Amino acid sequence: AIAVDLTKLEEKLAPADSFLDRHLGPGETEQRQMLQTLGFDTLGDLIDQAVPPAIRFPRSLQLPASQSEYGAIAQLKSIASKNQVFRSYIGMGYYDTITPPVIQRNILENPGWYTAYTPYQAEIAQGRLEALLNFQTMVMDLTGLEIANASLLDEGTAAAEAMALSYGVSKSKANAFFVAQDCHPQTIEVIKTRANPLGIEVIVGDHHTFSFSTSIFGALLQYPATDGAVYDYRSFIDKAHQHQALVTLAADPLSLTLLTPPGELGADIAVGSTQRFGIPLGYGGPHAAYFATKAEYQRKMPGRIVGVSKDAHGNPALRLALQTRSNICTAQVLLAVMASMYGVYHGSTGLKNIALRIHQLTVLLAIGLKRLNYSLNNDYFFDTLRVGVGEQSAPAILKAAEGRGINLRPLVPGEVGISLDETVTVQDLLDLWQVFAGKDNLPFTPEELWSEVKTSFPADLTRQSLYLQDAVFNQYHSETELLRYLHQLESKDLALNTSMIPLGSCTMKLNATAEMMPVTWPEFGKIHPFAPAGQTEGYQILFAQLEAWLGEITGFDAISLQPNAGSQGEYAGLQVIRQYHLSRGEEQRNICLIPESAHGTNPASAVMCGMQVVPVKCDGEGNIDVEDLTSKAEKYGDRLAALMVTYPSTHGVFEATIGTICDIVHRFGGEVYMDGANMNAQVGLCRPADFGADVCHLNLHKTFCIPHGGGGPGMGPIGVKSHLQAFLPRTDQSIGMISAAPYGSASILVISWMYIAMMGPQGLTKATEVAILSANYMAKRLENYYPILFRGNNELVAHECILDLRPLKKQAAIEVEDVAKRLMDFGFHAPTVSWPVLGTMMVEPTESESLGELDRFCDAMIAIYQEAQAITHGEIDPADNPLKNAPHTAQSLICGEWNHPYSQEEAAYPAPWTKQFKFWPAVGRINNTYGDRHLVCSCEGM
Amino acid sequence: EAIAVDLTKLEEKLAPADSFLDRHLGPGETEQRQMLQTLGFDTLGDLIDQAVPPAIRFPRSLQLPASQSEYGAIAQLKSIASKNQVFRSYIGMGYYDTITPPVIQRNILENPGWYTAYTPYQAEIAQGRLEALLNFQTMVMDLTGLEIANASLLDEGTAAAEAMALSYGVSKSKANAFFVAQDCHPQTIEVIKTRANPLGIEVIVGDHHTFSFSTSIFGALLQYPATDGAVYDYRSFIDKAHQHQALVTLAADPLSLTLLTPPGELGADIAVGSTQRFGIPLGYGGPHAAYFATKAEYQRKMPGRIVGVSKDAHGNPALRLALQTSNICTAQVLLAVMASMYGVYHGSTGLKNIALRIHQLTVLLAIGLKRLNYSLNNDYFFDTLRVGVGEQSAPAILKAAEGRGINLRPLVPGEVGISLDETVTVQDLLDLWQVFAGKDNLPFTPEELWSEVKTSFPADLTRQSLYLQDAVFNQYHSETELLRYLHQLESKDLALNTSMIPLGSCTMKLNATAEMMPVTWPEFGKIHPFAPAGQTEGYQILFAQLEAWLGEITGFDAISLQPNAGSQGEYAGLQVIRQYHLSRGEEQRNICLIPESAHGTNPASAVMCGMQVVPVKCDGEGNIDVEDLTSKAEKYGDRLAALMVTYPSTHGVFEATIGTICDIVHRFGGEVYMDGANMNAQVGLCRPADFGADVCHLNLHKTFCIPHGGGGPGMGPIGVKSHLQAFLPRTDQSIGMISAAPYGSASILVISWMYIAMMGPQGLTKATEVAILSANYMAKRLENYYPILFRGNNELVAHECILDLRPLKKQAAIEVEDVAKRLMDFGFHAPTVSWPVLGTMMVEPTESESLGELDRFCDAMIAIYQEAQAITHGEIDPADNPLKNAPHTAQSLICGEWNHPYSQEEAAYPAPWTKQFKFWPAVGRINNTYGDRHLVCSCEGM
């Protein structure tokens, strides 16, 4: 009414700063130029010919009008202010921690560290690869095990991965997995949810009293336990081995500075969270989980691993190793970088002092509580006490704590848990004692307790082995030293603050500063995921709005924000479809149709969901073969569970048959799952639910601006129709838990909230249309040099195109890898290489890159084409030329004798923009086969 | 408490926590012991006893709060900050809220790559900030319509005082009066009067309309728009002033100049103002870059620094500081960079739209206030209304406003001022109307007023000329584009995130992340400097603590935090001394003794203070000649105002005679002023007040961690003895105002508070001691290669040493400049060149740099020594060698023919560390003489 009058007044005013104009690369003049090149009169005409009219969304998205960056920040601040930052001593796998300011500013808030993606092009990712190598080394050192990966999603899913590995290397027919009842309860739920579709029996009970009478293939033990108790697990481990089972310890890595580590205990696998290595609570995440095991299991290791290899010059160089190896894809790289830098900055001595101090404060707390006549049940503990208070006092104690802004853990009636952490001071101790005392004057003085403190553990739990002894953990302890180390690593990596990284299937669009800013507000970053609901009302509002907006964008009736990667979204989606068929009394439906062009996460997820994968052929033009789909649907009619489809296709094509395809699947009793990684071609133009999908996931780290983080973090929320809503993961019928935290990595959800709020309905749709314009523009510019492999109706692509480089191989013996490395010399990260089609490149510019930048990339590809033609025409040595020898380091050009049939200038400055700004490749071409032959995954190798 | 001290004893029993001192210091205990052994001492304490004269050694610990961790100090400051209230201030008076584009906040203001280097003395490794400054000059020239502009001044009022001084210098008449319009901002008037006082300049303050020109003036200052908002046509006043041989300065709001006819077109001779509202936080006063623009004829008369376009050795364009009576040194570079990036990001169209919108909202506001029967006094305005409400209503309106978190400006009884700004929304106007209406239901609807708005100005005030038409202001409007432009410029510059910058007299120590963080908390950054005291209690506590702490460190009885540079500190100190002599009835005391080794700011400040400078000899050993001092003090006995002394000397030496020197000055009736730029050799070891200084300034941006900013911002607080306290600048006896804001750049004072709070008394003293250790270590390493020019008693230096490079000139025809450029090829910024002694380098490592870093720098100097020896010995051409051809760009090594008697590898990788990480000089050696000959100070030239 008045808001309406004001809104109308505001529209009369001179135009304010529109975030849309900062998010888009091409402005209106640049857009018109691109349309002229394509032969289209208007953007509307292009879009009307690209998107099949039938699936087209017939109206504007119903979303709030766009806000300025300033206004959206103000609105979110108001929301955030409703959260309450307590001192949470809840524990359960999340403990407050001090992020060193230098790491917060120069990594977490530095787009040089958070904008690149998975290190597919290793020669221009040595910086984050080194940080990941440090992460692996820290994990190996602390756990006492032989190999570790470059992170998993969270503790619970890492434990589930340990269950999967154990099942896979089992010698027996055992079908049961033992889970100690004192694992964190969310871990137990994640495990059960993963075991269910596989028919694995999960036995949950006291590890002291497990009979080994039912055969098990593995066991999971918590160290220290969820209630804080430290046990000697050696005899359990011995018996498990006698019964042909592997043992996984979920072990707190900070505690391992003091306690005998899994490796020395005889454990086969160790998992856990590195959250308390300086990563914000984040109301659940993101935090890098670790996974360590024996070298003999390396081929079964989930996720990615950094290995030390050598380059063309014989110099040490890092790369992702053993890539032939779970459905995990995007992981938690940025947070693994942060955790390893926490280890670098603190060193072995600093880390140990952090744990010692925590343990001393906990022992002191215990002594004081004993004097207050409370019962203390943990014989030994690291940071966590189990306190017997009685049913009558427990609620009153919890309430008194809350009165002082403190949360404790309700365990069982009459018992309360307290977990201390790096933030705890002696003043916090006093608060706790006064809360338990029920009065401020205590029967002891704090200092007098110290003489009674024994902080030692028994010999059989006392660690003697050293850790973090490599120079990297000792050399960078001044702030200035770490600043410089971070800077030198960062300078090796080509990220979005340098040039466009046109990775097909990845959507490397703008990660706007205003979107990133709220992630580190304490009101979002400092909340424990299991804090009482009364303290998290701001997050509640954030979730409700995001659920509504993503529901409107996808057309789905219900949204789950829990899954913390695309892979997890797919898995959650298939789990809900499975639960749906069971709810109908249709237990025999386990066939999952998957087109041959699908992302590899798809069939991996289906198999984890107990489904049998049946491939569906692609036709002559690369599209889903409808006849073949129909034939297979008919054949598996009684058993059809699902079709997993990506729209537009992984070929970058808008198939007009998508509706017909969904009808066929439904006709034969299946559900339709849509992989939503290509949603950047859809938003505002079409909605998955409207054309027949029953469920989809979204990659917020592709389409909705969560940064690529060097390979994580992501979020993979799912949308479902009403008939599936009852089965969504918990926040009688739920599938259980998919992620360890109820809302996964909640803190980063503010990024996508900010994007939607600043773009508004017209803005979001314009972004999609420009993403499509730019993809078609590059295809048009390059089509005479590299065949465009797949095109849709009207000869248009969607948001990405595939360039066929196979002719270059035939004509000049030039490999796709050669072109990828040569682009480095032009100052560019290669697009997606050899997926979904071997020997090709899939290029996705997104809407955020300017025409000048698109033209530079096209000009680079055209120059490389002309270099390849020189080889073809025999105008230069086919084995010794810039393509074969790329990337060219400065040292390779400047040092030693130059024996090539081309100039150093041709090598380093092959385009004029490189003489304005030169990005230097840090190492020469990395020998891939050598690194896999000789797996070296720790700093000892460098 | 009691209990508090008991918690302290307990905490001390715990395992050692992360201590900020160990992050601040470069060398740890092991490294310190190694350095001490090379010096022939066992302990640092024993070395310090020999370095500092026993007579002046502070005999106890500093009385300061015990050190806090980074986490604890942040928490303490946060609780202080929370006592400030962030209102919507429409106070105006030269400060207007503005939106700092998040991308600029994150990637410049919060990026140590932009804030850690200092003045661009070595242009070849500072092209990035030099370009940003060129953009700033261009922006100022375009908007003001004047021919030249500098690279920033300290604030608006001092810029106007600089304009007064320029006008005085060029006047040929006997005119002694300067006219200041009474509608200038009142703080501007007081700064002007304070500067005019010691020079005997008559300041006439009155209505410009009625100034008679009867009294001869040399200059006039007019405010545009006026402080009460009114926009006047100043052409006729300017014409009359010129007929009376006076220069006219307009203090002109640069945002308003997107709409209003600019000073140049009006006939103005000089334009000054603040660029604060180009996206710089209010900062409770600063820091903000002021501008100064004038006609080309007055170019050798311009205060401050200016960037000019020149060319390098290869003929390519390159920037440098050009044209090397004002005392200004450190300016506001970082904030000039921010303001220029605001111009780059918004462009001419964007800036104009921001101004148009503000003006439209202001016209809307006035129309509504009129409908409410209020009197609107400004015929024309930009953003500021003068509202007649009557004496009775004014207090109730101001209070109602405060009730909604709004500050208005009390002008005169019965009149209220309102200045709108970039943050203002239609919702804010509604609040304003309701506050003035005294109720929420208005007799009009917001939108219905729009038909009445006439936002045009008369033709004589309407700007037609264009601005910001250069490509740089058009090409970077997407966030991705600006991110990449910022990153490219940043990459050209060598800052503290790369390597040590051992600039003598500059103290390039750690600017710790924890110190920098609170600068951008809204509770510090978003407060108007003239907000009511009730809203700034957090700042009140901050100032009181900093004053107490700096008082304890210096031994002085009172501290003024107002002066916003070392130069301003010196000037404020001499003003207080002058006022002191006046208060005793001793008007004839105007002689200022100044040793010949003093920083050039010293005599400039003395002259601005109406004093006659008398030099004092420095002896053969480099020290103040006590016999000469005594003779000059005797000779000028009855006229002696002051001695300005630096301790330790500008030669880096603790003179044992300092106390005797002070006694002599006092004996002859003078005061002692100490230049405190070398306080990094003093903290905890001696105190100026204790050995006889009456007043000193501190450079917070040297000794106390405020970052160097690429050449600003700084703060120069002064400490005085009790007998001078009455005369301190205002926040019957005060000297008036030295800075435009009562606490200068208040927001950056949190940096020094954080440093002191985290270091504690032992930490601060250890820092001083390690700074002395490291300087001595370098001197010892280098002494057989480069003569150490001045040493104290016991053969030790203080915190810096002077390397004599003059023999190289005699032997090899090598200049200091050659060595400075060659260091670039080793990855180092040169130390201080040719000051205080021509042909030498003064090296100050500070305590924050590691032994490894100190050793790399010494090793580089030793390799250069050997390169010079090769020339001396005829082993390499004396004209064609790496010293003469430095710095070497990558392109000069890679492109074209290589015709040198040394290899490209010897040029680019002269030391092993350069093969681990190489910093590339962006340009070759810049031609200095050519640049000054052909002064080009705008983007037009490059």
Curated annotation (Swiss-Prot), chain B:
It comes from Synechocystis sp. (strain ATCC 27184 / PCC 6803 / Kazusa). Keywords: Oxidoreductase, Pyridoxal phosphate. The modification N6-(pyridoxal phosphate)lysine is found at residue 702. CDD domains: GDC-P (cd00613). NCBIfam families: gcvP, PRK04366.1. Its cofactor is pyridoxal 5'-phosphate. Its EC number is 1.4.4.2. Coiled coil: none annotated. One of its GO terms (molecular function) is glycine binding. Pfam families: GcvP2_C, GDC-P. The keyword Ion transport does not apply. This is Glycine dehydrogenase (decarboxylating). The glycine cleavage system catalyzes the degradation of glycine. The P protein binds the alpha-amino group of glycine through its pyridoxal phosphate cofactor; CO(2) is released and the remaining methylamine moiety is then transferred to the lipoamide cofactor of the H protein. One of its GO terms (biological process) is glycine decarboxylation via glycine cleavage system. The lineage of its organism: Bacteria, Bacillati, Cyanobacteriota, Cyanophyceae, Synechococcales. The glycine cleavage system is composed of four proteins: P, T, L and H. GO terms for cellular component: cytosol; glycine cleavage complex. Belongs to the GcvP family. It catalyses: N(6)-[(R)-lipoyl]-L-lysyl-[glycine-cleavage complex H protein] + glycine + H(+) = N(6)-[(R)-S(8)-aminomethyldihydrolipoyl]-L-lysyl-[glycine-cleavage complex H protein] + CO2.
